Amino acid sequence: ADLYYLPGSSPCRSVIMVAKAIGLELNKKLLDLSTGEHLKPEFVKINPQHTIPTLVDNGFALWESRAILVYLVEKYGKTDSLYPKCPKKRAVINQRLYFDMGTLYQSFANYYYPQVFAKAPADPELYKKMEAAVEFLNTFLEGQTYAAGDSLTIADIALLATMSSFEVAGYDFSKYENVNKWYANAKKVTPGWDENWAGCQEFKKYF
């Protein structure tokens, strides 16, 4: 399988952790977005939305990090523990995946991107939206070790890419006791944390 990717990109680093956790070897291919390499007809033909991460699996094209996480586990995972079959457990993991995209990482992008990519000054009402997101995650984590169920899942792995993006950008989330404890634990147990951490240093350069 091919993975078009940049190491700094959080949704790329989530795919890379899941591929490591299930022991799947990916053919990794850098795509220079600041160059506009992704807008090539070469890559549009693979993915008309021209986004990373994109996977090509024996010619089947797939994008959206979180659709890829599900598919890699479903098709390729030896056990279904990262994404269990039980629809209730799956359903909690899916909700946590939509949260990670539209609440958590979205608030993160919204606050930090305009500072680093368009130079605008910090907007303190987007700061609050961001903290209100982490607070939600804190709440989800109450009395829990992992984000969904009592087990490492693709929900943790996705949220781990996102929350390591938070740290490297300078957001101290120590005040959220459950998130901090989950973060500390997730680094110890997630396969390919160390690769994700390396990739966060390329992401750190934006700041």
User: Could you tell which of a second copy, ligand GSH, none binds residue 52, using a CB distance below 5 to 8 A set by kind?
Assistant: ligand GSH
Residues that bind a second copy (CB under 8 A): 48-49, 60, 62-64, 66-68, 70-71, 74-75, 87-88, 90-92, 94-95, 97-99, 101-103, 106, 136, 139-140
Cα dihedral value 89, 53, 105, 8, nearest 10: 130
DSSP state of 62: E
Looking at beta carbons only, is 24 or 101 nearer to ligand GSH?
Answer: 101
Residue 136, contacted partner among a second copy, ligand GSH, none, CB below 5-8 A by kind: a second copy
- Minimum CB separation of residue 28 from ligand GSH in Å reads 15
Place of tokens 């220079």: 32
Nearer to a second copy, 83 or 166 (CB): 83
d(CA 54, CA 149): 29
175 makes contact, choosing from a second copy, ligand GSH, none, with CB < 5 to 8 Å by partner type, with none
Cβ atoms < 10 Å from Cβ of 143: 5
Q: Tokens 């110890």 map to which residue?
A: 188
Helix, strand, coil percentages (3-state) for the chain, rounded to 5, are 60, 10, 35
Binding positions for ligand GSH, rule: CB under 6 A: 9, 11, 33, 38, 50-53, 64-66, 98, 101-102
